[PDB]
Ligand SMILES: [Cl-]
């Protein structure tokens with residue numbers, strides 16, 4: 366298991382514009398297109414993103430390309446973030462995957478907001494951090510995915526995904 370297979374399980378793949386769990390226009394492997402209510406504003410961003418007239422639809426390769434950019438951008442945002450970088454650097458390889466997953470889903474800013482949990486992970490207090498991570502809108506809104514991520518931080522293995 367790697368970051369790609371992990372995210373592909375949590376986000377799935379859809380080749381047609383769809384609405385995410387928040388109701389935002391998305392496509393591919395969790396690639397947010399826009400928070401705007403308009404399907405046309407979504408079709409627009411989509412074509413801008415791919416470089417062709419897609420008319421709301423893309424190919425597998427196009428989805429995988431967006432996915433490769435988004436993972437890279439997620440890592441690069443963590444590395445550039447003063448609050449995140451030190452956490453990331455302190456973590457083992459599996460756990461790093463768990464942080465990247467949160468970042469991909471909720472953005473740098475959002476994760477950077479879990480001050481207490483971040484401190485606990487840095488300190489390697491596993492069980493405590495799993496408990497604090499669960500007290501969040503994130504966990505209440507997408508509980509099966511949050512549990513998977515949280516188990517990953519708790520144990521440091523891929524069990525939740527196997
Ligand atoms: Cl809560």
Ligand SMILES: [Cl-]
Pocket residue numbers: 506507508509510511
């Ligand atoms: Cl869920």
